[PDB]
Symmetry: D3
Subunit: 175 residues, 6 copies
Amino acid sequence: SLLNVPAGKDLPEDIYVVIEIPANADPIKYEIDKESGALFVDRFMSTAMFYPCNYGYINHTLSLDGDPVDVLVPTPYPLQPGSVIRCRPVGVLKMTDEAGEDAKLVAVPHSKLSKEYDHIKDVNDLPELLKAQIAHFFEHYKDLEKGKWVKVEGWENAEAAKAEIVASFERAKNK
Amino acid sequence: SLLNVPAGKDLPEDIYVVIEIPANADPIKYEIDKESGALFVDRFMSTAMFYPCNYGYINHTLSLDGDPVDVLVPTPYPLQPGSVIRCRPVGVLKMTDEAGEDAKLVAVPHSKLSKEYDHIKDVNDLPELLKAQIAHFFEHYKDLEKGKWVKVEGWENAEAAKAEIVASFERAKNK
Amino acid sequence: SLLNVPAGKDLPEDIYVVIEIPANADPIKYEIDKESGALFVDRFMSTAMFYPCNYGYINHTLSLDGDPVDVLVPTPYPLQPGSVIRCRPVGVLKMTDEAGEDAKLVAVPHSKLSKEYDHIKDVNDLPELLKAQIAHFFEHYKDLEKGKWVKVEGWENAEAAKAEIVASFERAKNK
Amino acid sequence: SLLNVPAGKDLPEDIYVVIEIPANADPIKYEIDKESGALFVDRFMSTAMFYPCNYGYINHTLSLDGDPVDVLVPTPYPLQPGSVIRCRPVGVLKMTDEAGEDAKLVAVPHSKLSKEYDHIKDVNDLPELLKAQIAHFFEHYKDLEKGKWVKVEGWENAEAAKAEIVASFERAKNK
Amino acid sequence: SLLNVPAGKDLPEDIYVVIEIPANADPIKYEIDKESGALFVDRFMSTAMFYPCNYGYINHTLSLDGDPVDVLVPTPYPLQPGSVIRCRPVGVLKMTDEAGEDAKLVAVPHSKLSKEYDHIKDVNDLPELLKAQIAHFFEHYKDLEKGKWVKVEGWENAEAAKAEIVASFERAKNK
Amino acid sequence: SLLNVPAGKDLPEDIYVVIEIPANADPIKYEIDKESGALFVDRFMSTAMFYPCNYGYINHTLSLDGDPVDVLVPTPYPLQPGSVIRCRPVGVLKMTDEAGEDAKLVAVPHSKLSKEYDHIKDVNDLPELLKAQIAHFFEHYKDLEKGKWVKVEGWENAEAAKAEIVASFERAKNK
Ligand SMILES: [Mn+2]
Ligand SMILES: [Mn+2]
Ligand SMILES: [Mn+2]
Ligand SMILES: [Mn+2]
Ligand SMILES: [Mn+2]
Ligand SMILES: [Mn+2]
């Protein structure tokens, strides 16, 4: 099952991302329950906003917040929830929320699944319009959620992203 | 997996519902196969009707028909098949089909996932239009199915629903 | 055509609303071109937000901004662009944008098309969750649009809405 | 515009059908307003049923009910509302509703738009499953509509359908 | 209506394109009937292919085939059929079909509707993957259509495209 | 889970097919990872083509290519990825790709799930239009994939299909 999915083929540049929320989907936040591997509704968002890119996580990783690293994956057509994608990390969006540092990496479909994101290698390569849409999403999606706040610092490059993969991976391996 | 999902956090007012059929979906009846945890097509409905609310079941329960209690869950946007929702039972639709009493509870998204169904506490609280649409669905969806009939008695309140949760839960626990 | 659609059957409580943008649709802003009656793309929104309710206008009206009164219409299922709906005004969201007062009334499907919004008669009747979602939409949809700003004052009642219908209607009739 | 669309190229076997409601669409009944050519919402259906085939009418025809002949058009993929289709009548579903005889012909995409319905030439040719689904739809869609009833007589053949085209066409031509 | 839509604001670099077929839509070919302004089904495609970009035409133009120039418009989200888009021509795909030269220009959303295609100025700017997908579509969509053939020559630049706009525009103006 | 799904109830005429790719879905190729049971993205197709029928495989089978037999299943409405369908084999499309014989059987929904494909018993029974669409799909979907080729031989009957089920089933059982 989905709890036995590797972290990636060659960390940290060839990783697997488990999708929990597809791109352009109704405002429903899903999460895989680490206990059973089941997709669970987390909450219905009250805001009239949608995820700009597919959202998921890298399994067998533990970032600073408590949970696996959170990955946003732009794709040509929306992926299915529970499906796994083979990506390459290209950047990270630093933000501090309740949980404290809660970074969101941005990873693009690996070269073997599609030749379309091969020119994107680092955060300056992603379109400017897509960086501001994600940034704006994260600054406002929990605006109608009392007890939820988020300081969206800024963007960070591919090895800032790749360092968070090893660290989070190593942090989980050591119990 | 989905066969290890609890019945709920605090039975019978805080239960988990495994969704098998989303709201407003094409007429395809799905069911989780209790043997593997796989979603299986049960039948294509011949009628030009669709489920009015998300439909699923409470795991580790055995009602009178043979199967887990059947739950209908109204939500803002359709959920995914195989996903689990955290609900609060509010009523039950009594009906006798081939299998005999085959009640369908109506449960709404728990307070922690959305603040929108907090005013709904019992069956008089659900909109009148939605009770008649469900009722009408259940009276006519297997009309073009030879060997299928259904007497849709009436509606019952939240502790009529909550009694069917304990009873069905207890009935399954005792082998 | 759509340029010959009446303002309503009995102004201001029985009005027609021409839909330009459906509920829960991709972020594309459409507008009927007053010159030909054609639906024209106005802009692609850069934000990851969607209209919370169907959006359109009352024809043969001129509000303060230059254009017909802007109406938001909640419905059970999204309407088509270019289609006309028979509504009853119930409230207004006051906001000042570039254009100055740019109010947005909220009107619900008339009793003859559906019995579901009959209990809603004024702005206190609309669900609290839907008022804050619209309010929040209007406060942030043009956030990634340089040269666009919006002060979302507050909500106003059904005869505040009904006064803006007559005034805007009278303002257009007098050349 | 849509009020200037011919009845057909060669009545009654080569006719045009103006689509008002697509196949497999949410329960919203649309109608072209004969006065402006605008698509207008007629009502939101309360029942959890959807049109089984595209529904529309033949322009410049007047059947017994008051309105143009009503045509159901099965197609591979749902058509757009306001679009016109080139069909060939193959049968008719006799029913008496409030309005009295309110027949619904069934017409299939003409040979020039697709080679797929060429074997269907009369009502015995249409699949049995699709005749019963339409029949069942018409017997129950206005079940939750007080003041609406419908006796669905039976099915009739292609020249029963073709006679209703000429008669309705002639009945409209003579003022 | 749609038969009164200008050719563009400033030919040939600021043109209007009437959309007939949206991006990523079921295989149904639509066309505006020059006689009424109605969208008409032209044919159901038998192939399992879909338009890669929105397809439409520039009104008040006559290319070599008989019809207005044919334009493909890439956009972030699919547009509606019958809607008009404000574009800027960037290239052309030369092909000879039954009709002889039947070029297809590629035009992108004007700067005023979205800042996203501002870097694209000529055919070398469009992604390589999208040129080959369109090219491949046009080489194979009428493969299961007996009596239909197409030699897809190659791609041509923005002033090759802009010359076809003036020529086609001038060719229509002179009766 | 999905790795424990039987091959069928009564091989080879009553088999189970695990769906990986639904009908009429965006061009994303999915595959169940035999190691975890997770749906994995295989590749984004570059071509503007979509699967004509639901695609999946028969578990606990090994054809000549290395993988389980590949099955195409026509259905009234698209199925979900990861769901299992109960079918009856009716034919096979012989083709040699990189992997060598890579046959694709065509199986239709079993009589117990729907009465609609009961007349289809062998490959001459399937509509001609659907055989050519599948055939055409398989001849061109990897056209923009360098290192991918496919000779689509022809069609074969129900016991040619049924022999490939036993053989592939027996070939997997013997380690
Ligand atoms: Mn986090
Ligand atoms: Mn039951
Ligand atoms: Mn305004
Ligand atoms: Mn009628
Ligand atoms: Mn042409
Ligand atoms: Mn194979």
